[PDB]
Amino acid sequence: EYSRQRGQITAGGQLLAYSVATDGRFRFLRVYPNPEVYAPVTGFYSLRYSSTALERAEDPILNGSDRRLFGRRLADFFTGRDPRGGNVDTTINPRIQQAGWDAMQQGCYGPCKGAVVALEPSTGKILALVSSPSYDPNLLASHNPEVQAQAWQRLGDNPASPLTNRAISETYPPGSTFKVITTAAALAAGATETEQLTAAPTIPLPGSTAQLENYGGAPCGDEPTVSLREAFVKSCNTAFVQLGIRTGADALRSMARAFGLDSPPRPTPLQVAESTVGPIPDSAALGMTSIGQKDVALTPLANAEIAATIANGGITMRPYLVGSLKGPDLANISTTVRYQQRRAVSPQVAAKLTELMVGAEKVAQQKGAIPGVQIASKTGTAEHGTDPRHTPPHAWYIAFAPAQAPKVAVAVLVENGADRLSATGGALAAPIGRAVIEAALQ
Numbered sequence: 145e146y147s148r149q150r151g152q153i154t155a156g157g158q159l160l161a162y163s164v165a166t167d168g169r170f171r172f173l174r175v176y177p178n179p180e181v182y183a184p185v186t187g188f189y190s191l192r193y194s195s196t197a198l199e200r201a202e203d204p205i206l207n208g209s210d211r212r213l214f215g216r217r218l219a220d221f222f223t224g225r226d227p228r229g230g231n232v233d234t235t236i237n238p239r240i241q242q243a244g245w246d247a248m249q250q251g252c253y254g255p256c257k258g259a260v261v262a263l264e265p266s267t268g269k270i271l272a273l274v275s276s277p278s279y280d281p282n283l284l285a286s287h288n289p290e291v292q293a294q295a296w297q298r299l300g301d302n303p304a305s306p307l308t309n310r311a312i313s314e315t316y317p318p319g320s321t322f323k324v325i326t327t328a329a330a331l332a333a334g335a336t337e338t339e340q341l342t343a344a345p346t347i348p349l350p351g352s353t354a355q356l357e358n359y360g361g362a363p364c365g366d367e368p369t370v371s372l373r374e375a376f377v378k379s380c381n382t383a384f385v386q387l388g389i390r391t392g393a394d395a396l397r398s399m400a401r402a403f404g405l406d407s408p409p410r411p412t413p414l415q416v417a418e419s420t421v422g423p424i425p426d427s428a429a430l431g432m433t434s435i436g437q438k439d440v441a442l443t444p445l446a447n448a449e450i451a452a453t454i455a456n457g458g459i460t461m462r463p464y465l466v467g468s469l470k471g472p473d474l475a476n477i478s479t480t481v482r483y484q485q486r487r488a489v490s491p492q493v494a495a496k497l498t499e500l501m502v503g504a505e506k507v508a509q510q511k512g513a514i515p516g517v518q519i520a521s522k523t524g525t526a527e528h529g530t531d532p533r534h535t536p537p538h539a540w541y542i543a544f545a546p547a548q549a550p551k552v553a554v555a556v557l558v559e560n561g562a563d564r565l566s567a568t569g570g571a572l573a574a575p576i577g578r579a580v581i582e583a584a585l586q
């Protein structure tokens with residue numbers, strides 16, 4: 145294996161993983177020049193612990209044993225020249241990836257836990273895939289057995305779990321980002337932006353003693369009722385609870401399926417955890433589901449796709465991480481074909497969601513806003529866990545830009561909201577999302 149030069153993983157004409165000839169018993173050492181930043185993409189290639197992410201998924205291409213490559217390897221052996229693996233050109237934009245990483249390291253009064261996903265809505269290209277904290281795959285590329293095992297042990301016991309790709313492997317309550325799905329369900333059912341909903345600071349749940357309140361216990365406005373548009377841009381809870389229950393369990397399940405939930409995701413070639421709306425066993429649950437709580441659980445990737453789908457006029461592009469596979473001579477072996485996965489909503493519903501989202505962006509805290517770029521977004525702050533009231537919530541932000549003709553869609557998850565009980569998506573996640581947007585549009 146190691147007597148032969150393994151091929152490269154690339155992004156934007158830059159190397160993410162390469163192999164270097166050494167005096168080692170195993171000649172070739174695998175090197176990762178920007179290790180923690182790209183670990184979610186590259187994975188690691190280890191003597192002791194095998195391969196992960198694209199090292200693994202694209203292993204036959206990279207080691208030159210792929211059937212489409214094997215002729216070249218045979219000509220190399222016969223001819224006498226040194227064998228070389230093939231190349232994997234990813235869809236990652238290094239400027240967008242770096243910006244997502246940097247902003248997550250800086251944006252929680254110190255480093256954030258969580259993920260950043262950037263997508264090109266019209267193609268499905270995964271432009272960034274950041275998880276935090278990360279780890280150094282060079283540690284596991286070491287040819288020393290004790291260096292690998294010590295690093296493995298350390299990473300394994302680290303309760304922050306830096307090995308986890310939080311972008312695609314983990315699911316979290318979306319909280320109020322899911323108001324996008326509730327609203328879409330409502331609109332498809334014939335509800336309008338002018339629909340009058342409760343402004344009440346609190347709402348009881350049917351068939352339970354529990355109550356759901358607005359953030360800070362404040363009424364949505366000073367009038368008895370507000371328009372759906374106004375409830376959405378202010379992100380008032382009781383209105384969406386009322387709306388969700390009005391719209392009903394079947395329509396919401398249905399709309400969630402339409403946006404890719406409760407369907408097994410296609411590999412990118414990396415496997416993506418399945419997102420869900422939950423069973424919604426009763427109307428108490430429906431009310432909670434409506435604001436992205438109860439059993440709703442999404443990957444940051446799925447939440448970025450929701451944004452991307454709206455950005456694409458209601459058509460979900462199949463998301464993918466590999467743009468092309470190449471020979472060691474860089475002859476084309478495989479170019480990825482972009483694919484329309486399904487239509488989630490009519491262009492008209494997508495246009496109305498875009499309108500609502502632009503409004504919710506103007507309302508949200510304004511840190512990191514880019515002069516002359518119109519952003520559509522939805523913030524969220526999701527309670528979680530066995531002691532949710534005493535546990536810091538996740539700060540979420542999904543968005544796309546420019547709102548009129550989108551070039552990028554993002555999701556930002558700040559898991560546990562910088563260890564603050566008063567964490568919000570607008571305060572933590574939104575400026576991270578905006579910096580990624582700015583990097584993508586530069």
Ligand SMILES: *C(=O)[C@@H](NC(=O)Cc1ccccc1)[C@@H]1N[C@@H](C(=O)O)C(C)(C)S1
Pocket residue numbers: 318319320321358359378379380381435437522523524525526527537568569570
């Ligand atoms: C959606 O995320 C809502 N979040 C809060 O209600 C947190 C919460 C508290 C108790 C139970 C369940 C959830 C609203 N949306 C966010 C947001 O837009 O970021 C607000 C903080 C504005 S409240």
